[model samples]
Target: SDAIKMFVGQVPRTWSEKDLRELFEQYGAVYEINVLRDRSQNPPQSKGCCFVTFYTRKAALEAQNALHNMKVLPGMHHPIQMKPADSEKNNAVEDRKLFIGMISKKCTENDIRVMFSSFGQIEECRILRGPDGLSRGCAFVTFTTRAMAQTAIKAMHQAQTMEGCSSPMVVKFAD
Candidate 1:
């Protein structure tokens, strides 16, 4: 059985592996913790993000609920973000791709990826960009299965706003 895991971001650059483990251990037994690193940097520095695997799903969910958007580190202006780690188990369904329209011109491929990733394993995610490299206010997202696509459409279509875009999102099957 796959252990429950979560993606944690907005970590303080100064935090060490011990700090991370200590903070999350309050919720439950931490099986593993991996703080991402910038390998391209000289000496390789922390990337301010990490993955934490807990012994139980309940522990993972508890940490997610309590720690998400909370300023766990002192002197930080932004709160940390938390979400479920993407897993093949979540995408073990049918294949379904979706077209997303009216995206905020400010939204990037990564933003769209983060938004849709919660639904399932994304096969592909692309935001149409102009020659200037700015968003074209549209995107294409492909999921590993149709069930995931439908679920995303039902949950997010016209319901959630892009982080910086004022326009509501339009999600549907591609013709």
Candidate 2:
């Protein structure tokens, strides 16, 4: 139903749609697939990432559990990382923590704190990182209160793109 989309990263450049489908079908019925690309390049190159939609949440979760952080591609040095495409939304609860996504890879934890501090007292701010210690394009910020968290969400959710980031920030409650 397209409700469960998995974000796949660290894909081998040589892999194609057929490869992706064949790899993911073992988990369940795949609804659709999208291999991201950098169209600005002279020869548009694969972004080394993709999105796969499954017919059910269980299938998506099963695939995520089995494939995430596993070296599925031959000759690839790094294992792939997988997360729910709607991870931000799914994680959002009453935890008084906000999930920030699509942030600039170059953005630091201080930058996030500075941008989100204005809403309220920030208890903690952490930018998720990969094994190489690079930004994973997402972060978590915990506020002193739920009101502050909601306020921050209202002010920042898809409102504007941060400096050095190509996509607008997606803010939601963190599970």
Candidate 3:
């Protein structure tokens, strides 16, 4: 996650990975560079550009500083594009949290937590309840990682209903 990858355009095979490394070396630490596959639309191979990754995001920062709006030798430079991880949308915590429904209205946080604990570590659990108390048939369960949360959903979502509930539990991303 600490790696920052930038896109270099007008890719010329002759420039080479070491060639790109030298350019980045002039300004920051270079991790590596290579031809990466395009997502969805672009041709699968043979492009004039590739991803150049740096060690620290700070290296990425100054690299951006010099690259941005600073074309050298009368626009004779290959343009570089900046971007976060291709999947930066993978916000860690939210993916690990789940909203559950069809749960027993009488359930307590302790009960729900114990049930989900089988799948992974439970950071916590909350039973949605009305002002005067009494659960509202819903729960929020947070686990340690998205992987384990999905493990719970894969096997338990439609398994069996608790005695006080009418249907099997519903489990999905909290968001």
Candidate 4:
């Protein structure tokens, strides 16, 4: 899939994960962003460089084209830097799982499998039951790609209610 591990640099030393996320989520859903911290400080300091991984190649490419060497943050000598991590081929793409809730208590795996499978290939559908192994009214619906997961979420989240449920179903990324 030509997946990538994009690298970002020239960030503020004060930056953290949330800062990075709000900045990058504009490109797409971020799989993960890791800020490399320094060992010299007590509160931990960022190295002004980090790696951002997106679930799709399209996102990685877009971010690189928009952000690389284009902008500078406060107290920075260089403009922003964005590129692929050298360790790529890296074979790690993430954020492809979804957490669905508000399912009718009477629902079963077959109910979920049938609905979400139409969006994409279903990697797994897990219905979380009670400690007694009863209905817990939620599900973990995994798809082959983040795009597919989002499609299902758009089509399903609060979209409608099932036969026995009182409210619309909830579909979102796994917490």
Candidate 5:
């Protein structure tokens, strides 16, 4: 699931939705679009900033690459910046080690070991808890090798459909 996101600035209040969409639709599939309207006056007005989301990550990247720092309209400009949606999670996993979160509050090191051990050999397991010793419902699970961690990321990232959970496990290789 790739998502493309960016903001447009310096738009005039008179700009029309058709004009904006026409400018952005040239890049790729425009899945979501919004123009930040000003609510200060009796009727909302344009504040000169717009947000756009593309259907896929690659398309978003393409849109950002093609339109960034390039003017879309005369006297109005589109300076786009594209990046993965969960940048913080991506940064956390940049080192190529699997970091798992959102464990059951009652879970322990042994519980993590039991669930993750099937994927690969466990190198370290720790459950972060509050001062009262209650689980924070988060933990870190590392694998013996980077390959195993990658494998887990692929499998667990898409495991939601079966479990009816929207929060697909977030993983990144730990530094």
Candidate 6:
């Protein structure tokens, strides 16, 4: 049973973990409350960022749907930002692989594997599939290590050729 979490940012300068915990508790059980504190300041300003963990996905979803973009207090006071927790790999990939986009619409996951496999062992290959159960012409490819992922990105840029695409494949890292 994986716990659901959300990242809340843009908090009030005076808000505390206790207040945040109390506010979210209205929806469901809150297992943990973390308010990011400034290391440099003796007393940190809310700087408004936190990681909140809920006992269940439903609670987290409900909290996200309910609280996001809502004013926290009167005077249209500080609004809270909320969203689902991102995968660790998402952060890892920012410094890693180049997202291969504008892919051949006909390419399959296995096809991408075979084309890029020569660069390094693919840690993961996911083709963004469509509602009809076909490739969406884009994908995220992760390599075994950050260095390998970068290496593949560089190699793909210089290779100037792919398995069967009409033109060189489109490769990019976060815009």
| Candidate-wise lDDT, in order | 0.83, 0.86, 0.74, 0.84, 0.65, 0.74
Segments in model 3 whose C-alpha atoms lie over 4 Å from true places: 1-54, 57-90
Tens digits of per-residue lDDT, candidate 1, 1-175, equal: 3467788888987887889999999988999898988888578888888889998888987887888886566756778898877651464432467889888888878988998889998888988888999888889899988888999999988986765676788998876
lDDT of 3 at 4: 76
Model 1 Cα displacement at 165 (Å)? 39
Model 6, 36: alpha-carbon shift in Å?
A: 0.9
Q: TM-score for model 3?
A: 0.50
Give the per-residue Cα lDDT of candidate 2 at 116. Answer: 94
Error of 2 at 77 (Å): 0.9
Candidate closer to the true structure by TM-score (higher is better), 4 or 6: 6
Question: How far is 22's C-alpha from truth in model 1 (Å)?
Answer: 0.4
TM-score, model 4 to reference = 0.49
Q: Report the C-alpha lDDT of model 2 over 1-175, residue by residue, as the tens digit.
A: 3458888988987777789999999999998888888889598888888889899888988888888887567767788899877553542434789899988888899999999999999988999999999899899999988889999999999988876777899999987
Q: For candidate 6, write residues 80-118 as lDDT tens digits.
A: 788866642254655655578767778888988987888
Name the candidate, 1 or 4, with the larger TM-score value: 1
- TM-score of every model versus the real structure: 0.52, 0.50, 0.50, 0.49, 0.43, 0.52
State which candidate, 1 or 2, has the greater lDDT. Answer: 2
Per-residue error for 14 in candidate 1, Å, reads 1.2
Q: Distance from true position, residue 35, model 3, in Å?
A: 25
lDDT string, candidate 4, 1-175, tens digits: 3556788889897988899998888987799889988888597778989999888889887887788887777889888988888777332234788999888877889889998888998888889998888888899987888899989988889998876777888899897
Candidate 1 — number of clashing residue pairs? 7
Model 6 stretches with alpha carbons more than 4 Å out: 74-78, 85-175
lDDT of candidate 5 over 11-47, digit per residue (tens): 5567766676776678777777677798887888877
- Residue 132 in model 3: lDDT: 85
